[model samples]
Target chain A: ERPTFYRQELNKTIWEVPERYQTLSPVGSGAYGSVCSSYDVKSGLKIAVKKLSRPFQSIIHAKRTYRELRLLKHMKHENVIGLLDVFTPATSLEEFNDVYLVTHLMGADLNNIVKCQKLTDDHVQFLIYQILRGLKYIHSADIIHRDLKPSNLAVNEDCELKILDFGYRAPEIMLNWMHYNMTVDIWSVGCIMAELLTGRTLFPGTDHINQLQQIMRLTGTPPASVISRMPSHEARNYINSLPQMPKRNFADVFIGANPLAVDLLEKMLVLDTDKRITASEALAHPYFSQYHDPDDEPESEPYDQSFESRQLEIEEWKRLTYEEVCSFETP
Target chain B: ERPTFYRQELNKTIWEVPERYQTLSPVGSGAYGSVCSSYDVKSGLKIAVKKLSRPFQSIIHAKRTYRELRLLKHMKHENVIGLLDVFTPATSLEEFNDVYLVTHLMGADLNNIVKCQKLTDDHVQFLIYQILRGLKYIHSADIIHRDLKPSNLAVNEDCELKILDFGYRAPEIMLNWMHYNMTVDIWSVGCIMAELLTGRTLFPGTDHINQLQQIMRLTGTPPASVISRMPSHEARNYINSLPQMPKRNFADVFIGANPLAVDLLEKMLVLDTDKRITASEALAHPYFSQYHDPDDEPESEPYDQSFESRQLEIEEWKRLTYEEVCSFETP
Candidate 1:
C-alpha cells in the first residue's frame, strides 16, 4: 500500500557501518563476492574491501574462508597480497555473520594493463621476474598458487606486480592429490607469463573439461608417461580419449618475444609435474638475470596447504575459521 | 583489436579474495557505495558487506571513511552493530582503494520489515528495547549514532534489533557547529520510533531545508533560547525566516500506539536539545521500566568521537586510521 518502500528483495541494509572508511566504487565481483575501493581517512590510506561469496553457506565456503584467512595472515611478501585486517559486522557469534578482509588497493589489475597498455619487452621482463619472485616465495614456503591469471595479478604503471586469488587451486590440490606441490604454482606462472607476452589467456577454458582441452590443444595431449600418474584410471582414459593435438611451440605462441624467455616459459608448462622447472630454478634462468635481485631472496614461511586434503563439515570449518581468526596477528 | 575481453570498469579482480565466502548477488548501492549479503562458509554465517561511496576520491570521502572505522571499532554493545571483521582487497598502500565493512547479514532491515511484515506491539516492544539498549551503550560512550533510521536499524525474525550507520551526524556536527552530543542519536531514534508507530517517516523532509521544516511542522518552531544557541548568525537567521508552525502532538501522529509509548516518543522529539530525554533517563521512564533491566547497563568503552572536530589533511588522516587499527583489539 505504501509503494512497497521496503521491498524484501532490496537487500540494502547493513548492520555494521565501518567507522573509519568511506567506500568508493566497486572494483570487482565474482565467486569471491564484490570488491570495492575505500579511503581510510584515519590512515589516509586507500584500501580494497572484498565480501567473500557466501562464506558460511556451505562446507566449501567455510573451509575456503578458513584457508584464505589463515594463508593471508601467515603469508608476507611483496609478490603476494597481504592481509591488513579481518572483521565482520556481528560482534557476537549468536548472530549470524561473515568476514570482511582489508588489504592495500592496487591501481588496476594486470588484466586491464595487458588489454589496454602496450608493454615494452622490459615490462614483460620485470613482470615475469616478479611472478617468479612471488613463486619463489610461495614455493619456498611449500605452497602452490594454483590460480594465476591476469585478474589474479595486481600491478602498477611502474611494472610492480603481485600475485592474488588462490581460489583456482592446482589440480592436485583440488583433487587432494598430495604429490603435486610447487610445480602447480610454476604451471600457473607459465600460463600467466605466456598471457603477458601474448595479451591473451593461454587456456581460456569454459569449464574443467574445456580447461584440459584448451591446455592440451596448445601443448598437445599428455603422453602415457604423464597420464600414468592420474589417481584414477577413468581420468587417465578420459585424457586418452581426447583427440591428440600437436604442440604449438613457444616460438609460435609468444611471437616476437625473446627466445630465452620462451625457453623458461616452456620449462614451466611441462605436462609431467615432476619434469616442470621449480620457482628457484626459474629465477636463476638467463631470462631474468638482467632484472633479478639476488638480495631480495624469498624467505621461508611454514606454508600449510593441508586444508586442501581434508573434506571438512560445516561446523568443523566454522570452528577452524574462528580459531584461525583468533590466532591471526595484524601486520 | 582483441574485442576488449577486459573492461577497465569491470569491477571484479579483488586484491584479496576471501577464501571462506563466495559473494552472491548485489544487494544495494548509494552514498554508502554498495552492500552485499554473503554466506560465511566456515561459520555457517550469513553476513553483509558495505562499501562506503568514493572513500578516497575526495575530502568528504576521507572524513566519512575515517569516522566510520574509528567509531565502530571502539563501540561494542549487543544492541549496536558489532564490528565483525574489516577488510580491503588491496594488498599494499600504493594501489588505489576502497573500504568494505563485513557485518551481520540481517534477515531484513527495519525499513523493509515495517512495510512488509505484520509487526505486533510485542514486536515493537522488543525492537525498541534493543535499540535503546544499543543507544544506552553509545550515549554512555559519549558517541551519537546521528543516523538512526529504520534503514540503519537491522532486525531478525526473532525481533532482535541493532543500530548501525554513523553517517548521519548531528546537524551541528555535520556543519561544524561543534556543540552537540548524544542528543543527536536520540533525535534519530525518535524519528525511527515514530515511523514504527505509524507506517510513515516522522520528518519526511526532501532536503536539509525541507527536513528542518518537516521537523518544525510536527514539533513546532524552536523557542528563542533554543534558536540563540545556533553557532552562526546565518544559520540562526535561516531558521528564523521560516514561518512558525503550531505543534502537532504525538497523539495526532501515532494514533493507535499506547499512551505511554506516545508520551515517551514525545519526550524524544524535542525542539530543544537540552530538553530531549537522555538514553539512561528514557530507559527509566515508566513506559520502558516494565520491560527494562537496570542490570543490563551499557559497558564503558573508551569511545571517542573527537576526530570529527578537526579538518584533516590526507597524511594526518591516514596516520590516525593506522593508529586506530593498531590500537583496536578484536572482541
Candidate 2:
C-alpha cells in the first residue's frame, strides 16, 4: 500500500537513532543537561550522551548555549571533556531544543566524588593538577569556563578528571547575567579545589552580597585599590568600611592538606583578578612540579570575546547564534 | 530573592512555547512532525506550530527534511503557507530535533474541502490557479514539490488556497523515490483539480503498481520513451506490456466542467513527465487568462543541486546535516 511507505519512512527515520547507540541508563544531571551512559556499537566505545533540555527558549540563553558548544568544538585537552559528537534528534532547526552531546563516558562528576568521600590527598593533588591542565589550555586560548563548579567537573575510575559544561557558573549566572574573564574561572576552580578537600562548599553564600562577605571573611577584605575596580561604588565602599579582619590561614581550614597545596590554593583564591595566579603559572607552582609535563602545555592564540557577552540586545544574541549556525555552511 | 531571578530565567526559557502559546489542541500528524493549534499571546495570533519530531534519525531523510524547510524559508507567496516564525525552544543542537514551525492558522485543507463536497467550478479554477501560482515560484527555484497531494494543499473559507507540508507523500517517497521535475507536481495538481470537480480522488490506487495502473487506465499507456525514464526497467516493461489503453477525454470524467478547464486538466494529467504542462505554461493557459497576473512571476536563479543529494553515502549525508547544523557560524 502507498501508506506503507509513510509508515516505513517515519519508522525508518527513528530506528537509526537507537541503532547507533545502545542507551543504558542515566549517569548524571549537570546544570542544564542530563547525561546518560550509552554504547556506540559502530566505534566499539562506551560514551556519555547528554540530553540538553530546553536550550533555545530565549535569545540570550541560545547565544550563551553556542559559546559552550563552540568552546567544546575548539578546545581539545586530556583534562577537558572530549566532544565525540553533539547533535539534535529533530529533523530540522525548528525542533532543535533537545540537544544531545556525546562524549567519553565517565563514572561520575567531581561533586559526587567529593560527597561520597572517595577522594584521597592524591586525588586532591591530581584533580587540582588536571583542573589546572584543562584551565591552562582554556585560558591560554583566552576562553573562560566561567562556571567552574564541582558538578561541571567529571571523573573516571582511573583518577582522571575532565572539565565539562563550559557554559560556566558565577554570581552573574545566578543573577541571569555574563566582565567574566579567565580570572573568573579561577574563582570557580578555587571553589572546586576547596570543595574537593572539605567535601562541601567553602563559601555557601545565599546571595551576591553574602558571597562577597563570605569571600572577605576568609580571604580578608579588599583594599582601596581593589575596591575601586568593583562595579558598584556603594558596595565596594561598604566592604571597605567593614572592620578590618585578618585573612584566614589555609593551614587552619584544610587540616591535613600539604603546605605546598595550601600555598597554591591561597594564590588561586586571591579576590583581586590581577593578583590571582594565572592558569599557566598555577601549572608551574611547586605543588604541580612533580606532575607537570612540558609536552602537556598546548599553545593557544589570544581569544578576546568580552564584546560577545557584554551589554547586548536580544537581537544581537539571536544574531550571534544565527551566525554560529551559519558557520557550518559548506562550498 | 535571587532565586526569583533563577525561577524567572528558568520560566522565561519556556514562554514562547507553552505559556505564550496556549496549545488549544492537536491539529494533525504529518510524515516527520506533528501539528497543533495554539494561541500566541505576544503577537495575538492564532498559529499552527508543527513539531518536527525526529530529524537527525537518518541522514538522508534529515537532508530531505532540510530541503523542505529551506524551500519554505526561501519561497514566500500568498498561495504558499506563511512561515510566520520558525524557532527552537532548545538552547543547543542536542535538543534540536524538536523543531517548531509557526504559521498562520487556516481552515481545512483542500482534501477536507473536496471530501466535504463544498467546491464549485469557480472554486476549482481559482484553486488550480493558486496552486500554479505557488508552484510557479517553486519550479522557478528548480525545486520539485514531488509529494503534492490533497492534504498538502490548505484552503481557507474565503477560497484562498495555500500549499502545506511538502515534506511527504508519494509512491516514490520511500525506497528513496520521486526525474521528478515540475511535471510531477503538475500530476498532483491535476489530481487535486480533478478531485475538486468530481468531489473524490480520480485515481485512488492501492499500491505503487496499482497507482501506475490507475493513471494508465484513465490517461492511456505512454510510449516506450516515457516508460524508459522510470526507476525500474521491469516496472517500465510491465506497464508497456499491459493492454494498450485508449486515452479517455477529461470532459467525460469531469462532467459539467468548462471545456477549457478540462483541456488544461488533460494536458496536466499526461503520463509522460516531459509532455506534462509546466507550471509557468499552465498559469498562462486559456482557463486562467482572466486570473493571470504578470507580477506573480518572480525571477529565480538556476538551482542545480543534483550532486548534493545524488548517490550520497550515509556518512556523507550525515556530514551534510552536521555541516548544515554547523552552518550557523558568525561574522
Candidate 3:
C-alpha cells in the first residue's frame, strides 16, 4: 500500500483478511510491528505490506510513521526514498486495526554494500554531496533525522543511497530567527561522511548503553565544570555517568592517507553540544572541498575505499532496465 | 574526540593499544560493529562503546554512511536517539578518518529486549503507543520514515521506546501537500502489532527478492490497467517485472482482529500515491476511536507505553536505577 494503504485499511488483516489482498509470510518485524508481503489485485504493484502485532494506540510514533509515508508519497528527491501507497483496515474492527506503507522496494542496506566495496575518495565526495543535498532540503522543512545509521539508508537502481526512516526523529524546534535551528539531516550528513570514508562507525558500542561509552573512551571525558552546568540534575546525571569523551590530541585516524577528508570528520563529530560544529560549517570541511561545486550540478567521482574489491552486483538491475526495478505488473 | 581531543593524545595505555578497534578478532563484531570494553580515566565512567562498520559504498548505494549522525546533530527529540560526541583520528602518520556518532547510550533495541524478556500484552501495548506517538511527531514535520521496520526502533531502560533509524525515505518532495501521503510505517506498525500478539512476524521471506516473490505467491498479480496508471513509468515497469504480490483479503491477514484497526492499516500501507490516508485522518478512523486522546498526559494514565513496563519488576528493571541505567555515562 502507498497512500491509501497507509492511512486506513479496507479490511482488517492482523487477525483477519479480506477477499482482495492476500497476506503472505512475514518479511520483517520490529518494536511496533511486523511487515509481510501483500498484493492488490486492483492495482498491479509488488508491495511490502506490514501489519502491527496488536492494537497500537500511541499518538506520537504512529502519527510520525504515518507522516513519513505522507512525505514520501509526495516528495521526489534524488537521494530520498519513495512512497507508493498507503492502506487502512476496514471499519468493522473495533479495537485492533492495521495500516500499510507501500513504496518502491530495494535490496539490502548500505551496511551490506560496504562489505564488498570500499568507497573511493571520489565516490565518497559525490555521495557526500548528494546526501548533503538531501539533508539541506530536509533541514529546510524544519525536520530532524534523529536516528541516522547505515541500516536506514537504502540503495536504488542507480546505486545511489537514499536516507530512509522518519518516525521517532522529531521535527526541529523552529526558532523565530533562522539561527541555531540545526535540521535533522545535518548530524546525519556528518555521520554519513565518516561512514563514507572509513566504512566503520566512530563509536560502535554493543547496545545504546555502550555506544556512548565507546565514544567517551576514545575522546577525553567531559570536564566536570561542563557536567555540573547541565540544566537539570537528571540531564547532568545522564552526562556525568557517561564514559569520558576526551578530545583527541593525536594526528589523525586515517594513517597513510590524506588529512583533508579525515580532518572534515573531526570537525563535524564534535562531542560537546555547545562546541559541536554546525552543518553549514561542515560543508566547508575539506571532505567536500575535493569535488564540491556549490554553483554547479553533482560531479561523478571514484571511491577511495575500493581499489581492490568490487561489490557483488544485484542481478536484477544489471540485467534489467529501469522498468524491471519497479516492475510488478505490465500493461 | 571532542574538538579539543582531536589534536591531543590520551594516555599511552588506552590510546596506544594496537589494532584495538581495527580488527574483527575473536571478540568478533558486536550487533552492528566492533564492541570493546574500556575505561575513561577522566570521568571514571565505566561504559561500553560500539564501532559501526562501514556502509556499502557501491555505485547503486553510493553515499556517505554517516547520514544518521548528520541528522542527529540537530534533532532534539526526547524519545529519539541523541548524538553526544565525535571521535577523530589519533596518529599523526596515520589518521582516524572514520566518523563516529555519539548518542545518549541506552539499553538494547526492542528486538533484543523482547528476546531477553518475556513481554506481557500490556508491555507490548505500551511499546505500540510509544511508537505511534513518536511517529506522529515525526510525521507532522513532513518527514517520511521509509524504514518503519521495527529493528530500527530502540527501547530505553524504562522500556520507553524511541523509533530509531526512522527518517524520510525520499530525498526531496513536497513537505506539505503533494502526493497522497500516509504511505509507510503503517505496514510496519501493523507488523509490529502482529508480533506483539504472536511473538512472530506475520510474514517471512528470506531475502528482498524472495520476499517479493512470496508476496506474489499469496496475492494475485495486479491488473495491467492499474500498473499502467502508476505515476512513473519506471515505477510501473518495476511493478510489472517483479513477482505478483499476494492479496491479504483483510480478514485473512488480521484474523479475528478488530476491523477498524485493520481498516487503518489498509489505508496507511496502500500503494496508490494519491488516495492514501493521512496520519491525523487515521487518528479519526473508527479503529483508533477506542484509545487515542491527544490531550492524554503520559504520566497520568496507562497510555504511556513505559508506564506499565517500568512498574513491572521483570526482575531486571528492579535492579536498574537511574544511577545504574545511566551510571556509565560521561559528558
Candidate 4:
C-alpha cells in the first residue's frame, strides 16, 4: 500500500506532505517552488519541505526537477544539504504530478547573513572552509554546481554552512567547448570569497560580455594558449580583440584582508582554468589550515551521470521520480 | 556466415573495405578520418569511402563517429549528403574497431568552386536556393548542421549543392542556454551567402571573440530585448559592454549585387537570433522566386536524437556501430 499524505494550505499554495512531517510554517519561496519549515513527528527534527512549483509544467521543468532530486538523493555530505524524505500526493502513475522534497532546515542563506551581519575573519574562514569541504565531495562526484552563489549557501547562527541549489552550466560549456571540468566551481568560490571579504559582488556585470570585461579587468586577458583551447572561434577572436589588461593584485583589491586569504582567492580566480586551484587543493591552502581536516573532508563515489543522457518523456520522468520517492522508507 | 572483406593501403593508413568496392584512390584526409574515391563494382557508381581515423581512440571520438553515422543514415535529402553503405572488417564485437562509410562522390566542394570559378548571378542564386532547400529539410528533421561552411558543401560542375558535415552546437547552446533552435544554421547560411557574393570569408575573426566582433561590425550591436533573452549573463554583459555600432547597409556592403539578394542576406544576418530569417522563410524570399518550388521542397520526419543521449563505453559504441553497419546488406 502507498503511504498516507496530509494536505495543508500555506502562502496561498496547497502542500500535500507526508503525515510524519507536521506543524508546517512558511520558510521561503522561489520561482521553482515553495518551502515550509516543518517538524518530523517520528524523528523530532526540524526540516524544510519544498513543493516543486509545476514540475511537470514543461519537459525542461520536469527534467530539472528530476535532476535536482537525483543529485540530492545521491549526495551525502555534512557541508551539503541532505535529503531526508521525498513524497507526492499522487499514488498512481496517472495522478503523480507533484513532488515534495524534505531536507534539514537552516536559519538563513548566506546572502542574508552577508547583508545583515558583520562576519569576523574567523567566521569567513570557517564558512569558506565548509563551502570548499562540500565542494571537494561534489567535484569528486564530477558535479559542477554552476549556480554557486551567496544565495545558494544555507547557514545557521553557529556559522555552520551547507551548500544548496544545484543548477546552471559552466562558462567553458557556454564557450562551446566540447568538455568542461570542475574549475568553474572554483571560479564561483573565488567570487564568493571576494564578496564575503568586501561585502559586495566581485564581478556583477550587466550581461555576459560585461561579466567577462568585469572579470578581465581583475583576472586580465587569458593568453592564446588558453584561448585556443576554447572551441568557439568567435569567443577566441573577442578575447584577442580586447585591450590586454594586467592582473590586479588580490592583496590590493581585498584591502586589510589576510594575506593567506588573498593568496587563496588568487589561485581560485585564475583565468587559465587548468591553473585554478581545486577544492581539495584549496582546503590545503594556508588560509584554511586551521579548520581543514583531511580525514573529515570525505570524498564521494563518482556520480553515475549516464541517467542525464537519457531523453525521457514527462511520464517516464514522473514514474522514475515516484519510484525514487517510494524507494525511501518513511520514519 | 559473414561478408568477405578486401584490404588496401593508402595515405599511410590501412583500409579494410568490402569486396564490392574497388579501385580506391586517396581523396583527402582529416583529423577524424581519411577519404578515398572508389568504384563500387556491384552498384557501378563512383563513391567516396571514408575510413574513420582511430574512431575508438577516445570515448569522445567514438561517440562523434556514431552520431555522424546515425545522423547520416537517418537523413535522405536531395541536397544533403546520403549514406550509401557502412562496413567494418571485424565479425566479432572484440574485433570491431574500424568503421567505413560510403557516400556519393562530387566534383568539388563550394570552397574550391568559390576560389576557382567566378559564379554568375544565376549560379549564386541557385546555389543559395539549394542550400536553403537542404537546410529546410534538415531543420524539419530537428537537425542543426552546426558545421555549415563552404567547404562542408559539396558541389558538381552542374552547380548542384549538397550540405555535408553535421557537427557543432549553436551559439545559444554555448551561451549556457537550456535550449537552442535551428536559427544557428541560418547564421551559417548567411555567412555562406556572403562568401559566395564576395571571394572572402565575411567574418573570419582570429578567434571566437573576434568572430563576434567581425559579425557585430557588419550586423551592428543587438538591442537589449535580444541580449536579455540570452541565458549567459557573461555573454549578455560582454555584448552590452561593447560600443554600440550602427547596422551596416547591405546594399552598401554588397555594392552592385542584386537588391533582392541583398534583401535576403539582410534577413539572414540579423544579430538577433529570433529576428534571423529561417531556411523556409529565406527560400520563400523574392531572391529565390526563380528557383523556389514549394512542391519540390520536401520535409523529413524528425530525426530521433534519443540515440545521442546514450553514454556508452568505447566497446559498447563499437558494438552498436558494428551492428548498425551489419544491418545494411551488401550490394
- Error (Å) of candidate 3 at residue A252 is 3.8
- The DockQ values of the predictions, listed in order, are 0.01, 0.01, 0.02, 0.02
Rank by lDDT (best first):
4, 1, 2, 3
Q: Sort every candidate by TM-score, greatest first.
A: 4, 1, 2, 3
**Every candidate's CA RMSD:** 30.5, 26.3, 21.9, 27.3
lDDT of 2 by residue, A132-210 (tens): 7887775556443344333467778877888776320111111111122455567667877788777767764332333
Candidate 4 ranges with C-alpha deviation above 4 Å: A1-331, B1-4, B144-151, B166-181, B204-214, B226-248
True contacts kept of each: 0.00, 0.00, 0.00, 0.02
Lowest lDDT 10-residue stretch of candidate 4 chain B? B166-175
lDDT of 4 by residue, B82-149 (tens): 78888878877787888888888887865587686577889889988988888777656654223333
Candidate with top TM-score is 4
Chain B TM, per prediction: 0.70, 0.70, 0.51, 0.83
Candidate 1 lDDT for residue B268:
84
lDDT of 4 by residue, A43-158 (tens): 89888888999998766577678777888887788888878888878877788888889888887765677685577889889988988888777656654323333236888878
User: Which wins on TM-score, candidate 1 or candidate 2?
Assistant: 1
For candidate 1, give the docking quality class from DockQ.
Answer: incorrect
**What is the lDDT, from 0 to 100, of the residue A220 in candidate 3?**
43
lDDT of 1 by residue, B49-102 (tens): 666666666554666677778766665677777677665554445553656567
Q: Write the per-residue lDDT of candidate 2 for residues B1-331, one digit (tens) a residue.
A: 0011111122122223545666455767767676778788778877786766565566546655565555555556677775676554444554454445677777676547777675567777788898888877655554433433334788777788887765201111110111243445677788777777777668653223344555666667667654565433433444565344455566678788888888998888876555778888888898988788787566555544433324344455545444443443211
Local accuracy by lDDT, each model: 0.61, 0.59, 0.44, 0.70
